[PDB]
Design a protein around this ligand. Structure first.
Ligand SMILES: [Zn+2]
Ligand SMILES: [Zn+2]
Length: 384
């Protein structure tokens, strides 16, 4: 973007850095620089996505000057030319910067480009389209004025006033309060969540410095947890552990997901160090401390499981060749099929401590294919 330098009055360069913020707002950073005199400046502006009021531009077109007017037309805007009973309804076209004449030329092209086909296969309809196209083309000869109406409930559409600071009598601009219909059509204060804050802290056994990574995880659809990942350099002590940070003493949780859709792959997923994972169709269960303490996705976990199991074969307790296991090859094939979306299976996460999460893509509503059972674990066979 070429912009005037206020320090030397040459043209320099403006870079625009845009940031989305919650609740239909945007920050625009305009960073100016001039290579010639070295001057530089930055302005930070905050903008709403939606204006307070809808806008309606009613332009009487009389001259080439009017035809040359720049037009910004948002996707939510309706366009009409009432003298031709013509309408481009909202959401027919994507947002665009054009001109008044450009608008009309694009409409002509939209009708005209397929007329060779239409004239061949639908003669009578094509004849009436040809007749309308001629009416649009006639507007460019400008023997009579016509009206262009652009009505946008978002308020973001724009029609240029080519008469500079002077008045623009040919263009009547009205503003209106949106109906609830208009508001809903547009998808109508702060979101200060901190989903993850991460820091190194002491070794929980040896008090060595900065040996444990601690992640405070505070997502909306799940209780606060702290993930601790140790890997000691001074003592060798290694552990991954998820702990509940809130008041609720967690019960056991058994989550059963029926995997029915490739979309299931992107479900978010925390597995704790006490969470067993089972895929009953594949006769497979993972140890509780395995491949977890990790915030991942279902696809991420399944691919990890595929690597662990099928890419690290061994034999313990017999003389069989670990690289020739029928059941391992069967497992690899079927897991691949689940990952690719070509096979349905149940995925069960069972955590007696309730420190594990699987995204419910229907939240806060129930997922028909996901069942969560809660239970109390009173007995530990390893000694409690
Ligand atoms: Zn300059
Ligand atoms: Zn240590």
């Amino acid at each position: 973007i070429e912009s005037l330098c206020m320090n030397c009055y040459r043209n320099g360069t403006t870079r625009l850095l845009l940031t989305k913020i919650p609740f239909f707002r945007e920050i625009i950073v305009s960073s100016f620089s001039c290579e010639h005199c070295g001057w530089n400046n930055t302005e930070i502006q905050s903008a709403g996505r939606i204006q307070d009021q809808g806008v309606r531009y009613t332009l009487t077109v009389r001259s080439q000057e009017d035809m040359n007017r720049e037009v910004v037309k948002t996707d939510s805007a309706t366009t009409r030319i009432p003298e031709l009973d013509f309408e481009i309804p909202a959401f027919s076209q994507k947002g665009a910067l054009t001109t008044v004449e450009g608008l009309i030329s694009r409409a002509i092209s939209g009708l005209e480009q397929d007329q060779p086909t239409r004239r061949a296969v639908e003669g009578a309809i094509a004849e009436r389209i040809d007749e309308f196209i001629g009416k649009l083309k006639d507007l460019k000869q400008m023997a009579s004025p016509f009206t262009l109406v652009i009505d946008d409930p978002s308020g973001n559409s724009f029609v240029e006033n080519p008469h500079a600071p002077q008045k623009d009598n040919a263009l009547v601009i009205t503003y209106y309060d949106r109906t609830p219909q208009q508001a809903e059509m547009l998808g109508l204060e702060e979101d200060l969540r901190n989903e993850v804050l991460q820091f190194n802290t002491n070794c929980p056994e040896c008090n060595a410095p900065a040996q444990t990574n601690m992640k405070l995880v505070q997502i909306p659809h799940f209780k606060e947890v702290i993930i601790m990942a140790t890997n000691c350099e001074n003592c060798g002590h290694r552990t991954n552990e998820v702990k509940s940070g809130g008041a609720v003493e967690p019960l056991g949780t058994r989550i059963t997901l029926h995997i029915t859709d490739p979309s299931d792959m992107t479900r978010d997923l925390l597995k704790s160090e006490t969470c067993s994972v089972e895929i009953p169709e594949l006769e497979f269960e993972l140890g509780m401390a395995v491949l977890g303490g990790k915030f991942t996705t279902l696809e991420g976990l399944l691919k990890d499981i595929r690597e662990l199991v099928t890419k690290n074969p061994f034999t313990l307790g017999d003389s069989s060749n670990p690289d020739q296991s029928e059941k391992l090859q069967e497992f690899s094939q079927k897991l691949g099929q689940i990952i690719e979306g070509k096979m349905k299976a149940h995925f069960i996460m069972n955590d007696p401590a309730g420190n594990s999460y699987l995204q419910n893509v229907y939240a806060p509503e129930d997922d028909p294919e996901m069942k969560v059972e809660r239970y109390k674990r009173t007995f530990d066979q390893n000694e409690e």
